[PDB]
Amino acid sequence: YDPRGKHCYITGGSSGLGKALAERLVKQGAHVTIVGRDSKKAEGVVEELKAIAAPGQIIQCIAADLTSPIASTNAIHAACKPHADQAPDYVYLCAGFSRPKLFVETTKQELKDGLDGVYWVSAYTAHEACQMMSKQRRTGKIIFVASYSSFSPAKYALRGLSDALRSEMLLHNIDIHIFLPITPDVCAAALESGLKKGYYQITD
Amino acid sequence: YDPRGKHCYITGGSSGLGKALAERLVKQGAHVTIVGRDSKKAEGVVEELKAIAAPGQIIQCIAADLTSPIASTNAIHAACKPHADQAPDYVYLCAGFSRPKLFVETTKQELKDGLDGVYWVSAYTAHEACQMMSKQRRTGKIIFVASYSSFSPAKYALRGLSDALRSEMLLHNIDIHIFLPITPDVCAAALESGLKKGYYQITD
């Protein structure tokens, strides 16, 4: 886990923990690609980080709804045209919304929306991510982030997919990790902490 | 947990564990409603069980894809027109398919299909189920069944929803349970076993 000079593709990088992670993955000296839906929100942060980058560091961003398989697929693909079609190395999955409610209060379309909102954002990407490194036959990491509710299912699903992959994808020699979390940049340290120390599961 | 004279609505009741459960929930003396997709498969089992029922026991079945919110919603509603619009008492969630594969091998549409296949079949029902007892303001139980992969997420999701509900729905005074499993009828005993003994989590 040496991030410097490495493509770091970070979903949800335009808000809390995801932005934080970019801040430092830059300070250290990576190529940092943030994804989000809000173009201005992200292209703002882009230039904020562009400031403190040393010249020649690719610091781009991409507007996409990562609840669409196609958007998820086109995004990661987009972010490597600059990087000579080199797959990313380190991929960070921080996209998420939390609009908490009561089961009985909730429409079925509300439930579907919340799973799409928390699971697939991470999963649809993670898929095409592996599919990329696999076929290019390169390595590098995939890092999931998790943590009245009824988003809970979606969080468990992530653990579920982490665990399935953390098995499987050591046939295509790909690291798999997951986070179980304080100013975001704190949690950011916890993560880089446990990552250099190689644990598959990481807390604060 | 006295099943006799109680509406027992059982998704996936036309195959393994779900059929088994009907066998005994009849032998004991319930009103038993099996749901499945295969009309002949189910209307077969229906009459098989109709044999061994004592007269006056409502033993019906319903063909529905429980991956549609509307099908899931119309089914449970259908199965209570005979039962004087009385919500079910005991609801058993055994619908499921397992078509195991490699992540890298899998299409994104394959993954979506597998979650729909294992989670929503149970969840879309469980929702309308509660929504029914809640608004009728009656009690009764909701029982989830769980247990290279990439159906794993969907299993974790169930545990996830079980856990969320097992909290929440003790505001609408509704029992919540879950199964973690041998001839199906074995597992069937394990379940009725731990259910009369009131544990929320049940193994074999």
Side-chain angles (χ1 to χ4, degrees):
Chain A
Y1 179 54
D2 178 44
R4 194 199 267 96
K6 309 263 229 149
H7 188 198
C8 287
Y9 177 93
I10 308 173
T11 72
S14 73
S15 251
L17 170 61
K19 179 188 177 172
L21 249 7
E23 299 194 35
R24 311 143 47 78
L25 281 156
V26 176
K27 272 143 190 180
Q28 287 163 56
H31 301 234
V32 166
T33 305
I34 57 168
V35 184
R37 304 157 306 200
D38 190 338
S39 182
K40 278 209 148 180
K41 186 168 157 176
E43 295 228 15
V45 179
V46 163
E47 279 273 285
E48 282 185 355
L49 304 172
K50 281 224 120 138
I52 70 96
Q57 263 187 267
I58 303 194
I59 312 301
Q60 58 186 352
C61 82
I62 294 200
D65 197 319
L66 303 205
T67 68
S68 186
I70 328 311
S72 279
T73 295
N74 294 326
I76 187 156
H77 283 317
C80 307
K81 284 181 187 80
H83 277 271
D85 305 349
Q86 283 202 352
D89 315 322
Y90 303 170
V91 186
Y92 308 71
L93 307 162
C94 317
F97 81 64
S98 181
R99 215 208 315 111
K101 206 176 194 192
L102 286 180
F103 195 63
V104 276
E105 285 189 325
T106 319
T107 57
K108 298 198 177 56
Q109 185 53 74
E110 271 163 26
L111 302 166
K112 174 141 174 54
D113 273 322
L115 175 93
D116 300 0
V118 165
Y119 186 61
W120 293 105
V121 277
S122 289
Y124 279 141
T125 304
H127 191 248
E128 197 38 87
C130 289
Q131 261 188 349
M132 273 196 67
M133 298 161 167
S134 267
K135 294 181 174 145
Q136 296 205 1
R137 285 188 145 287
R138 317 157 43 113
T139 82
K141 316 169 150 270
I142 310 283
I143 313 91
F144 295 95
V145 186
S147 178
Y148 61 67
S149 72
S150 79
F151 52 82
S152 287
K155 299 275 192 194
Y156 281 42
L158 295 167
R159 193 158 181 175
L161 176 52
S162 189
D163 291 355
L165 297 197
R166 175 260 186 160
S167 157
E168 256 210 39
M169 265 322 114
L170 287 301
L171 187 150
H172 289 289
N173 154 34
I174 313 183
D175 304 346
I176 302 281
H177 313 247
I178 170 132
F179 196 65
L180 295 87
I182 47 180
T183 43
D185 57 332
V186 162
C187 307
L191 178 47
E192 295 221 63
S193 190
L195 260 156
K196 272 209 160 155
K197 302 146 207 217
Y199 323 136
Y200 149 77
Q201 202 152 2
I202 296 159
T203 24
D204 51 20
Chain B
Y1 179 54
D2 178 44
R4 194 199 267 96
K6 309 263 229 149
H7 188 198
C8 287
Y9 177 93
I10 308 173
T11 72
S14 73
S15 251
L17 170 61
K19 179 188 177 172
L21 249 7
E23 299 194 35
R24 311 143 47 78
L25 281 156
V26 176
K27 272 143 190 180
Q28 287 163 56
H31 301 234
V32 166
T33 305
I34 57 168
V35 184
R37 304 157 306 200
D38 190 338
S39 182
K40 278 209 148 180
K41 186 169 157 176
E43 295 228 15
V45 179
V46 163
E47 279 273 285
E48 282 185 355
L49 304 172
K50 281 224 120 138
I52 70 96
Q57 263 187 267
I58 303 194
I59 312 301
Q60 58 186 352
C61 82
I62 294 200
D65 197 319
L66 303 205
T67 68
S68 186
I70 328 311
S72 279
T73 295
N74 294 326
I76 187 156
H77 283 317
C80 307
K81 284 181 187 80
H83 277 271
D85 305 349
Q86 283 202 352
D89 315 322
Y90 303 170
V91 186
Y92 308 71
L93 307 162
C94 317
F97 81 64
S98 181
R99 215 208 315 111
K101 206 176 194 192
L102 286 180
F103 195 63
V104 276
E105 285 189 325
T106 319
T107 57
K108 298 198 177 56
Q109 185 53 74
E110 271 163 26
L111 302 166
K112 174 141 174 54
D113 273 322
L115 175 93
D116 300 0
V118 165
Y119 186 61
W120 293 105
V121 277
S122 289
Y124 279 141
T125 304
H127 191 248
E128 197 38 87
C130 289
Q131 261 188 349
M132 273 196 67
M133 298 161 167
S134 267
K135 294 181 174 145
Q136 296 205 1
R137 285 188 145 287
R138 317 157 43 113
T139 82
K141 316 169 150 270
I142 310 283
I143 313 91
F144 295 95
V145 186
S147 178
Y148 61 67
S149 72
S150 79
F151 52 82
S152 287
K155 299 275 192 194
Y156 281 42
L158 295 167
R159 193 158 181 175
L161 176 52
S162 189
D163 291 355
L165 297 197
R166 175 260 186 160
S167 157
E168 256 210 39
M169 265 322 114
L170 287 301
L171 187 150
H172 289 289
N173 154 34
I174 313 183
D175 304 346
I176 302 281
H177 313 247
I178 170 132
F179 196 65
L180 295 87
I182 47 180
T183 43
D185 57 332
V186 162
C187 307
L191 178 47
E192 295 221 63
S193 190
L195 260 156
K196 272 209 160 155
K197 302 146 207 217
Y199 323 136
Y200 149 77
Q201 202 152 2
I202 296 159
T203 24
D204 51 20

